[PDB]
Design an enzyme around this catalytic site. Structure first.
Site, PDB file in Angstrom:
ATOM      1  N   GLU A  10      -4.953 -16.148   7.310  1.00  0.00           N
ATOM      2  CA  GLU A  10      -5.721 -16.779   6.247  1.00  0.00           C
ATOM      3  C   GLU A  10      -6.924 -15.905   5.924  1.00  0.00           C
ATOM      4  O   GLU A  10      -7.795 -15.701   6.769  1.00  0.00           O
ATOM      5  CB  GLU A  10      -6.182 -18.172   6.678  1.00  0.00           C
ATOM      6  N   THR A  12     -10.033 -14.404   3.026  1.00  0.00           N
ATOM      7  CA  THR A  12     -11.319 -14.888   2.535  1.00  0.00           C
ATOM      8  C   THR A  12     -11.164 -15.453   1.121  1.00  0.00           C
ATOM      9  O   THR A  12     -12.052 -16.140   0.614  1.00  0.00           O
ATOM     10  CB  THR A  12     -12.381 -13.767   2.527  1.00  0.00           C
ATOM     11  N   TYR A  13     -10.027 -15.153   0.498  1.00  0.00           N
ATOM     12  CA  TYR A  13      -9.716 -15.640  -0.841  1.00  0.00           C
ATOM     13  C   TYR A  13      -8.536 -16.600  -0.776  1.00  0.00           C
ATOM     14  O   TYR A  13      -8.467 -17.572  -1.532  1.00  0.00           O
ATOM     15  CB  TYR A  13      -9.375 -14.470  -1.767  1.00  0.00           C
ATOM     16  N   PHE A  69       2.740  -3.136   3.247  1.00  0.00           N
ATOM     17  CA  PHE A  69       2.760  -3.854   4.519  1.00  0.00           C
ATOM     18  C   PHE A  69       2.567  -2.954   5.733  1.00  0.00           C
ATOM     19  O   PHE A  69       3.238  -1.930   5.879  1.00  0.00           O
ATOM     20  CB  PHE A  69       4.045  -4.670   4.687  1.00  0.00           C
ATOM     21  N   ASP A  73      -3.209  -5.131  12.923  1.00  0.00           N
ATOM     22  CA  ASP A  73      -4.601  -4.842  12.585  1.00  0.00           C
ATOM     23  C   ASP A  73      -5.383  -4.332  13.792  1.00  0.00           C
ATOM     24  O   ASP A  73      -4.886  -4.357  14.920  1.00  0.00           O
ATOM     25  CB  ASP A  73      -5.298  -6.053  11.941  1.00  0.00           C
ATOM     26  N   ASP A 114     -17.103  -6.568   2.831  1.00  0.00           N
ATOM     27  CA  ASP A 114     -16.638  -7.520   3.842  1.00  0.00           C
ATOM     28  C   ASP A 114     -15.716  -6.876   4.879  1.00  0.00           C
ATOM     29  O   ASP A 114     -14.659  -7.417   5.203  1.00  0.00           O
ATOM     30  CB  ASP A 114     -15.941  -8.706   3.166  1.00  0.00           C
TER      31      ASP A 114
HETATM   32  O1  ESJ Z   1      -7.646 -11.097   4.009  1.00  0.00           O
HETATM   33  C1  ESJ Z   1      -8.518 -10.987   4.898  1.00  0.00           C
HETATM   34  O2  ESJ Z   1      -9.683 -11.441   4.839  1.00  0.00           O
HETATM   35  C2  ESJ Z   1      -8.196 -10.256   6.046  1.00  0.00           C
HETATM   36  C3  ESJ Z   1      -7.587 -11.145   7.137  1.00  0.00           C
HETATM   37  S1  ESJ Z   1      -5.899 -11.168   6.608  1.00  0.00           S
HETATM   38  C4  ESJ Z   1      -5.913  -9.556   6.028  1.00  0.00           C
HETATM   39  C5  ESJ Z   1      -4.858  -8.771   5.808  1.00  0.00           C
HETATM   40  N1  ESJ Z   1      -4.713  -8.008   4.724  1.00  0.00           N
HETATM   41  C6  ESJ Z   1      -3.580  -7.279   4.686  1.00  0.00           C
HETATM   42  C7  ESJ Z   1      -3.185  -6.444   3.724  1.00  0.00           C
HETATM   43  C8  ESJ Z   1      -1.987  -5.747   3.807  1.00  0.00           C
HETATM   44  C9  ESJ Z   1      -1.204  -5.944   4.934  1.00  0.00           C
HETATM   45  O3  ESJ Z   1      -0.025  -5.287   5.072  1.00  0.00           O
HETATM   46  C10 ESJ Z   1      -1.643  -6.819   5.917  1.00  0.00           C
HETATM   47  C11 ESJ Z   1      -2.805  -7.460   5.774  1.00  0.00           C
HETATM   48  S2  ESJ Z   1      -3.580  -8.553   6.767  1.00  0.00           S
HETATM   49  N2  ESJ Z   1      -7.166  -9.179   5.744  1.00  0.00           N
END
Ligand code: ESJ
Length: 274
Positions: A10, A12-13, A69, A73, A114
């Site tokens: 989940e 931030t948007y 993808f 992380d 962020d």
């Molecule tokens: O959206 C966020 O705030 C943080 C937590 S979830 C996230 C992720 N963004 C991507 C973008 C591409 C991808 O292959 C995996 C993720 S997880 N970023």
């Protein structure tokens, strides 16, 4: 048209899904959220250290972003490496690449605002990529927030991303978050307690910032050797420049890349359990 594979998380948007194009077979990351035009411009950003925004889908009066993808992380990787720690050569490589990504984005006048381990993605080849660049400005956890933001400055600069990266750098080294605040003031005071309560000497204009209070307690700055042991002096030096109070004194991404700390930088391969 897209097959929900699993909830990556989940954001931030909105909510993030690993998804498969039910036609091309492509495996992508899907995020369900003036903004249209702005984020569409972000599709042109291409850099090996930036997570590719494949396509922007505006349909049924709702907004989906399709991303390149990646399987893991930095957050999960740091947790998985918490026993041994990430080897310095890999930490150094990741930092070097992340600074490249920031430098590219900052040269194009794009900020992240962020940064955090959850939007830093890695692969098997030793690469690391920044996700969610420019999303903040377009669409209009406190641990990695720059002090100028916490003090209510309305105008952000590239320096806010450098602060965040610095905090993440320290977290990779110590295997513990640098400033894990539980509120805006706790976040602010954790910073003050470590780096010293800022004044006009070290940060001209600070006492005139919207949320600054003269009633702020006066903590003295502590030795940096206590903050990120056992990082060498090259690394501690770089970190102190990334963590300057004054955003104008804070080192840029391009200057950081020239720091002696990166003289022996390599590109190691991490072992990932996917
Ligand atoms: O959206 C966020 O705030 C943080 C937590 S979830 C996230 C992720 N963004 C991507 C973008 C591409 C991808 O292959 C995996 C993720 S997880 N970023």
């Amino acid at each position: 048209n897209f097959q929900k594979v699993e909830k990556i998380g989940e954001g931030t948007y909105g909510v993030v899904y690993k998804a498969r194009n039910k036609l091309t077979g492509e495996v992508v990351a899907l995020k369900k959220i003036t903004a249209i035009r702005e984020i569409s411009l972000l599709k042109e950003l291409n850099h090996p250290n930036i997570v590719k925004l494949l396509d922007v889908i505006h349909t049924e009066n709702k907004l989906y972003l399709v991303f390149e993808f990646l399987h893991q992380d930095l957050k999960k990787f740091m947790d998985a490496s918490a026993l041994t720690g990430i080897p310095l050569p890999l930490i150094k490589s990741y930092l070097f690449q992340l600074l490249q990504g920031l430098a590219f984005c900052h040269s194009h006048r794009v900020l992240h605002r962020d940064l955090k381990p959850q939007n830093l993605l890695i692969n098997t080849e030793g690469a690391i990529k920044l996700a969610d660049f420019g999303l903040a400005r377009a669409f209009g956890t406190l641990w990695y927030r720059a002090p100028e933001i916490l003090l209510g400055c309305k105008y952000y600069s590239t320096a806010v991303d450098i602060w965040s990266l610095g905090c993440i750098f320290a977290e990779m080294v110590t295997r513990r978050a640098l400033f894990p605040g539980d509120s805006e003031i706790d976040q602010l005071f954790r910073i003050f307690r470590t780096l010293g309560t800022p004044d006009e000497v070290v940060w001209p204009g600070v006492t005139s910032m919207p949320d600054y209070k003269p009633s702020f307690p006066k903590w003295a700055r502590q030795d940096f050797s206590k903050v990120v042991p056992p990082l060498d002096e090259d690394g501690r030096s770089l970190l102190s420049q990334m963590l300057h109070y004054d955003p104008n004194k804070r080192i840029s991404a391009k200057a950081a890349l020239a720091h002696p700390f990166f003289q022996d930088v390599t590109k190691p391969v991490p072992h990932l359990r996917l």
